[PDB]
């Protein structure tokens, strides 16, 4: 649930519907331009101070890296 709310600020888009004469490759990149202003890290790297940038990279890393992404515990417990 934390990751679902982070997606918009981390350039993560869901699959879009495709009509006729439409290519997801040519559409997903268009959608990515719509939510370009929301992509946090790039924005801060563009207007932020080195200190702000460093703090943004660290926070962004912590936000995207969760146990559910590829780690589990019950196995180690046993």
């Amino acid at each position: 649930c934390d990751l679902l709310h982070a997606a918009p600020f981390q350039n993560i888009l869901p699959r879009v519907h495709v009509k006729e004469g439409e290519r997801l490759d040519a559409k997903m990149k268009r959608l990515e331009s719509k939510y370009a202003p929301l992509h946090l890290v790039p924005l801060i790297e563009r207007l932020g101070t080195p200190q702000q940038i460093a703090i943004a990279r660290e926070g962004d890393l912590l936000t995207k890296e969760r146990l559910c992404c590829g780690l589990s515990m019950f196995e180690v417990i046993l």
Binding site: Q51, Q52, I55, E58, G59, L62
Partner: protein
């Protein structure tokens, strides 16, 4: 003549000192502004560490 001159003088001395006091407060206000910004970054950094 001395009376009119005395009035102009006192008003000038107060005005000059008034502007100085105001400039002082404006500077101190920005000091707190920068300090809060620095403290916030320190806070963010500590939060990142604890995590």
């Amino acid at each position: 003549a001395y009376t009119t001159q005395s009035l102009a003088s006192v008003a000038y001395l107060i005005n000059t000192l008034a502007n100085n006091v105001l400039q002082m407060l404006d500077i101190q206000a920005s000091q707190l502004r920068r300090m809060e910004s620095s403290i916030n970054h320190i806070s963010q950094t500590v939060d990142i560490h604890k995590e």
